[PDB]
Symmetry: C3
Subunit: 102 residues, 3 copies
């Protein structure tokens, strides 16, 4: 399995996108929590309050999921970050496979 | 070293389990923070408020730790997710080894 | 690209350090959020409220970034944890490369 991390400008977009991804059976679950982001914009350090999203899905769904996030994301240039899971308890993995599209 | 991520239904269970794992010297530390989870239950998108837990330990303790989490977890099917750490500052790694069981 | 995770004792140190790292062009962005940490200190389970920081940068900047965090960190023994990113959308990766030092 894999984790995918992305960030959203607030809760309405984060929840809309995550619920669409669940409906499309591209993810098994999402964990959403606020953070404060700091980055460069035009020679200045910018802050933005955001909602980060930790998504859990199968490896084989990565490219499809990445494309759908690109298509749904409120940001022109979103972060869509895949981190592979090195091991997981089998009962959870079985559930995640059951809950994702075939 | 490794990270292990799991989620709990609230703070009392999260803290009880993490403190037991510390007492058993199976982890060196835990970072706990709230999130909102979205997933499928019986044809419906369900939300649950949870406490996520980021645990830090040695690679060689993974199987023992995974079994103990299974045995302590309030969920029938918990997420117990191992992500390997590709590098870490040595002083921290030494501390983590010192603080975990031998 | 890589993620680097570290923790700070509160927001002032976290923001000062992250903004210095941005100014030095060692990271492209940071996501900061509170957590509660549990760990061993002198035979007792200790808790501390902290700010965790998720940093995003290039692989080739890891050693320089790790040294700078050591030099800036309020902790004697900070956690400075590198997790490699297995894949990312190209538009984001291009932006991250553009925003980091050359
Ligand atoms: Cu905002
Ligand atoms: Cu709940
Ligand atoms: Cu504190």
């Amino acid at each position: 399995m894999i984790i995918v991390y992305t960030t959203f400008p607030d809760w309405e977009s984060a929840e809309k996108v995550v619920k669409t991804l669940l409906k499309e059976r591209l993810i098994a679950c999402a964990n959403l929590r606020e953070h404060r982001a700091f980055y460069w914009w035009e020679g200045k350090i910018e802050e933005d309050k955001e909602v980060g999203a930790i998504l859990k899905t199968r490896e084989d769904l990565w490219e499809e999921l990445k494309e759908r996030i690109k298509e749904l994301h409120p940001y022109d240039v979103p972060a869509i970050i895949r981190i592979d899971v090195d091991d997981v308890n089998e009962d959870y993995l079985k559930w995640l496979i059951e809950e994702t599209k075939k």
